[PDB]
Amino acid sequence: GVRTSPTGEKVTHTGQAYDDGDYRRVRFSDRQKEVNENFAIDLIAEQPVSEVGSRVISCDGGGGALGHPRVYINLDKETKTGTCGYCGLQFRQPHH
Amino acid sequence: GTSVKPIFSRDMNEAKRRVRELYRAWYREVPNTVHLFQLDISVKQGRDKVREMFMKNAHVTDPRVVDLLVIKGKMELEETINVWKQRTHIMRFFHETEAPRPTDFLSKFYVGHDP
């Protein structure tokens, strides 16, 4: 999520933060450094992994045409849960 | 081949001629614009600027080329005596706001990577 820089700035999702000297920091004074709190990085981790039982699983992303191009994730490597490259939803086989 | 169609002039000489009445017209033209256009430069400060363009344009030798810019100069003179240009347009000849650019290699080296 959003942490605080040693100067007092708020690090964004990309990790950008104007450092100590960083003359550019003058703009934020008398203003705010716009930062979005809903960090995408940790807003997808807590989503549970589907325990669907098959070998190839499609992922429309929800809503059909509202989602993303239908990709088939291979749920065969029994070490790491397969994730759709478009939305990050983790899918895994139900450990046989 | 070498044979090319000339614009107006038939060799250098009358090509050298046409640049003259352009200078003849330009020289007569300087003092009234300084008055009409309300310029900040002196009457003397206009003749040099009229002058310095001319042998700035001195390496040119082709008769067709010479006649080509004497028309451009005539057109520039044309668009000047009807106050079609403005104070800003004329003043653009005087590179005023643009700070002087260095010339020596060492100064080129100090400022930035450029020839």
């Binding site: - | 090319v4 169609k5 614009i7 082709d62 067709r64 080329v65 080509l68 028309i71 057109m75 520039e76 044309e78 668009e79 079609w84 240009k85 403005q86 104070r87 800003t88 347009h89 004329i90 003043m91 653009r92 005023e96 706001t97 643009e98």
Partner: protein, 209 residues
């Protein structure tokens, strides 16, 4: 027609214009160098530069042509071709509801006779072409810049001219007047190399030079 996407073809118009192509070619073999009709029924009359005035008068005055409307007067600057600029006229025939295109070539220096006499519409088109490209037109009533700013140097539509240009403008307070400065973009124009490395049209394949 089973095909619902392909544009329909009009062979009758194609034959009709091609016959007129042989017509104009035979009447003026002195200037007409090439005549062709495109697949979409457009006739291009490839003339020599000195034929700008004679050929135009023929299509404007001959009873069987009667092209009495100057549609447009353009040039396409091709840096490749020896004489880069290529002056293009488009004429519309009211009586025979047909359109013709006379195209001629010209370098930077050689002038082209102004078509103001045969087509008084060309007069303002004449000024634009010189202003944008630098093709000087001979014996013109008044050749002058029509589009660029007063005192603007260079010919913009010329290919060698940069997209952004050389001169910017801003207000400078120590002079209390708009002043010109060398161009300095806050963002350079991101040029895109969006050309497929695969041949697109076998029909228009150039000979294996």
């Amino acid at each position: 027609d089973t095909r619902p996407t392909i544009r329909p073809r009009n062979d009758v118009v194609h034959k009709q214009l091609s016959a007129f192509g042989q017509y104009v070619a035979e009447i003026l073999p002195k200037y007409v160098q090439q005549v062709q009709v495109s697949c979409f029924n457009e006739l291009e009359i490839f003339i020599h530069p000195d034929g700008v005035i004679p050929v135009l008068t023929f299509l404007r005055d001959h009873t069987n042509a009667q092209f009495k409307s100057l549609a447009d007067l353009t040039a396409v600057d091709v840096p490749t071709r020896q004489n880069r600029f290529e002056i293009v006229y488009n004429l519309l025939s009211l009586r025979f509801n047909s359109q013709i295109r006379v195209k001629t070539y010209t370098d930077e220096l050689t002038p082209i006779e102004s078509s103001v006499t045969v087509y008084k519409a060309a007069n303002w088109y004449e000024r634009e072409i010189w202003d944008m490209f630098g093709v000087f037109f001979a014996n013109h009533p008044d050749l002058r810049r029509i589009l660029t700013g007063y005192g603007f140097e260079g010919h913009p539509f010329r290919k060698d001219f940069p997209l952004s240009g050389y001169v910017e403008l801003r207000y400078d307070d120590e002079v209390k007047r708009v002043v010109a400065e060398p161009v300095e973009l806050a963002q350079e124009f991101r040029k895109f190399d969006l050309n497929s490395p695969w041949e697109a049209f076998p029909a228009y394949r150039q000979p294996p030079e």
